[PDB]
Enzyme design. Sequence first.
Site, PDB file in Angstrom:
ATOM      1  N   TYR A  28       0.760  -1.250   0.000  1.00 37.73           N
ATOM      2  CA  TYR A  28       0.000   0.000   0.000  1.00 37.73           C
ATOM      3  C   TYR A  28       0.796   1.310   0.000  1.00 37.73           C
ATOM      4  O   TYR A  28       0.301   2.335  -0.485  1.00 37.73           O
ATOM      5  CB  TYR A  28      -1.020  -0.002   1.145  1.00 37.73           C
ATOM      6  CG  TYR A  28      -2.214  -0.871   0.827  1.00 37.73           C
ATOM      7  CD1 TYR A  28      -3.317  -0.351   0.152  1.00 37.73           C
ATOM      8  CD2 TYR A  28      -2.222  -2.224   1.161  1.00 37.73           C
ATOM      9  CE1 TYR A  28      -4.414  -1.150  -0.160  1.00 37.73           C
ATOM     10  CE2 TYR A  28      -3.312  -3.032   0.851  1.00 37.73           C
ATOM     11  CZ  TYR A  28      -4.408  -2.482   0.185  1.00 37.73           C
ATOM     12  OH  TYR A  28      -5.498  -3.271  -0.121  1.00 37.73           O
ATOM     13  N   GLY A  30       3.044   3.877  -1.413  1.00 35.05           N
ATOM     14  CA  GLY A  30       3.456   4.162  -2.780  1.00 35.05           C
ATOM     15  C   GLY A  30       2.303   3.979  -3.748  1.00 35.05           C
ATOM     16  O   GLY A  30       1.151   3.922  -3.325  1.00 35.05           O
ATOM     17  N   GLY A  32      -0.758   3.093  -5.978  1.00 32.60           N
ATOM     18  CA  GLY A  32      -1.823   2.119  -5.844  1.00 32.60           C
ATOM     19  C   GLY A  32      -1.843   1.434  -4.490  1.00 32.60           C
ATOM     20  O   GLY A  32      -1.369   1.961  -3.480  1.00 32.60           O
ATOM     21  N   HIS A  48      -4.150   5.230   4.990  1.00 35.69           N
ATOM     22  CA  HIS A  48      -3.792   6.492   4.345  1.00 35.69           C
ATOM     23  C   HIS A  48      -4.328   6.560   2.915  1.00 35.69           C
ATOM     24  O   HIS A  48      -4.843   7.597   2.475  1.00 35.69           O
ATOM     25  CB  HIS A  48      -2.273   6.706   4.377  1.00 35.69           C
ATOM     26  CG  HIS A  48      -1.842   8.055   3.891  1.00 35.69           C
ATOM     27  ND1 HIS A  48      -1.263   8.249   2.653  1.00 35.69           N
ATOM     28  CD2 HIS A  48      -1.902   9.276   4.470  1.00 35.69           C
ATOM     29  CE1 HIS A  48      -0.989   9.531   2.493  1.00 35.69           C
ATOM     30  NE2 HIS A  48      -1.359  10.177   3.583  1.00 35.69           N
ATOM     31  N   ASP A  49      -4.191   5.454   2.194  1.00 33.68           N
ATOM     32  CA  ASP A  49      -4.753   5.326   0.854  1.00 33.68           C
ATOM     33  C   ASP A  49      -6.260   5.605   0.876  1.00 33.68           C
ATOM     34  O   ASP A  49      -6.777   6.349   0.045  1.00 33.68           O
ATOM     35  CB  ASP A  49      -4.488   3.920   0.311  1.00 33.68           C
ATOM     36  CG  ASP A  49      -3.140   3.793  -0.378  1.00 33.68           C
ATOM     37  OD1 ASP A  49      -2.273   4.673  -0.188  1.00 33.68           O
ATOM     38  OD2 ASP A  49      -2.943   2.794  -1.109  1.00 33.68           O
ATOM     39  N   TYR A  52      -6.911   9.347   1.401  1.00 34.75           N
ATOM     40  CA  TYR A  52      -6.712  10.096   0.159  1.00 34.75           C
ATOM     41  C   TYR A  52      -7.856   9.867  -0.821  1.00 34.75           C
ATOM     42  O   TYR A  52      -8.207  10.763  -1.603  1.00 34.75           O
ATOM     43  CB  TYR A  52      -5.375   9.741  -0.493  1.00 34.75           C
ATOM     44  CG  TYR A  52      -4.209  10.581  -0.019  1.00 34.75           C
ATOM     45  CD1 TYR A  52      -4.220  11.194   1.234  1.00 34.75           C
ATOM     46  CD2 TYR A  52      -3.104  10.786  -0.843  1.00 34.75           C
ATOM     47  CE1 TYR A  52      -3.142  11.969   1.662  1.00 34.75           C
ATOM     48  CE2 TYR A  52      -2.035  11.560  -0.420  1.00 34.75           C
ATOM     49  CZ  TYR A  52      -2.056  12.145   0.826  1.00 34.75           C
ATOM     50  OH  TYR A  52      -0.979  12.910   1.240  1.00 34.75           O
ATOM     51  N   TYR A  67      -1.342  22.700   3.072  1.00 32.71           N
ATOM     52  CA  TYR A  67      -1.913  23.003   4.374  1.00 32.71           C
ATOM     53  C   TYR A  67      -0.891  23.686   5.280  1.00 32.71           C
ATOM     54  O   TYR A  67       0.236  23.932   4.865  1.00 32.71           O
ATOM     55  CB  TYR A  67      -2.474  21.731   5.021  1.00 32.71           C
ATOM     56  CG  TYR A  67      -1.554  20.527   4.984  1.00 32.71           C
ATOM     57  CD1 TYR A  67      -0.433  20.460   5.809  1.00 32.71           C
ATOM     58  CD2 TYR A  67      -1.828  19.446   4.149  1.00 32.71           C
ATOM     59  CE1 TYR A  67       0.406  19.359   5.789  1.00 32.71           C
ATOM     60  CE2 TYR A  67      -0.992  18.325   4.117  1.00 32.71           C
ATOM     61  CZ  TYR A  67       0.119  18.294   4.952  1.00 32.71           C
ATOM     62  OH  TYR A  67       0.959  17.208   4.942  1.00 32.71           O
ATOM     63  N   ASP A  92      -2.576  12.983   6.600  1.00 32.67           N
ATOM     64  CA  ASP A  92      -1.128  12.879   6.710  1.00 32.67           C
ATOM     65  C   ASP A  92      -0.622  12.797   8.150  1.00 32.67           C
ATOM     66  O   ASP A  92       0.277  12.017   8.453  1.00 32.67           O
ATOM     67  CB  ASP A  92      -0.452  14.064   6.009  1.00 32.67           C
ATOM     68  CG  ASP A  92      -0.552  13.996   4.498  1.00 32.67           C
ATOM     69  OD1 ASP A  92      -1.045  12.992   3.939  1.00 32.67           O
ATOM     70  OD2 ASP A  92      -0.134  14.966   3.860  1.00 32.67           O
TER      71      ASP A  92
HETATM   72 CA   LIG Z   1      -0.816   3.702  -1.852  1.00 29.41          CA
END
Ligand SMILES: [Ca+2]
Lengths: 118, 118
Positions: A28, A30, A32, A48-49, A52, A67, A92
């Site tokens: 996960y 990086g 995709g 995190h993916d 986003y 931000y 983040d």
């Molecule tokens: Ca990713």
Amino acid sequence: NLIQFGNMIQCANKGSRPSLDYADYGCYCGWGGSGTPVDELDRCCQVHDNCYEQAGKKGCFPKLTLYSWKCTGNVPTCNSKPGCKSFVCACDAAAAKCFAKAPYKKENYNIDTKKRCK
Amino acid sequence: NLIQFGNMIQCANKGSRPSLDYADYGCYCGWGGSGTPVDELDRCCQVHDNCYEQAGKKGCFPKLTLYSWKCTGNVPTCNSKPGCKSFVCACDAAAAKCFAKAPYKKENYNIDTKKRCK
Ligand SMILES: [Ca+2]
Ligand SMILES: [Ca+2]
């Protein structure tokens, strides 16, 4: 933005590991993300993916969003105003905190994602 | 800008000391800018004040300048290449590195600069 995220990672882990170390990790971290995360750190990246993804559905470009944040008490802390800035900063800072608590496992860095991810 | 500078300080010192501890120290750290620096840390701030004066003369507002920087392996690194952004970034990066290697002496925090600085 992504440069700020890297700065956050360093804040949260008190300089224990460079942020570039996290750029291509597991299934996960990086580009995709697919399949079951291979370990705790990869689980951070899956979360995190998804964050986003949710930012994108709200009209944000989370890689670009600029931000305001502060490294305080070794915790990345969002200053930003509402909207995309607040939302992406939250994604983040959360990931940075999660990375910092999880053990880095070199064997899971830069893996063949086609072979190991699904 | 000053928030980024605080983030650089945390970057260089691996979060070992809060940024606010440097906002009123000796004769030069903070609003002060006169007399003989009281110690090694205060000398860092003297150099940084000189750098900020140079930025101003370049037409910059160093407290406000919004640059691009990366904490790379505990080293604040400027990404901005030109203008006020690159120059002010350099001032901040150098001070952050200077602070991290200097010993902090709390007896020099918040001294009466009207009395002790010339
Ligand atoms: Ca990713
Ligand atoms: Ca000063």
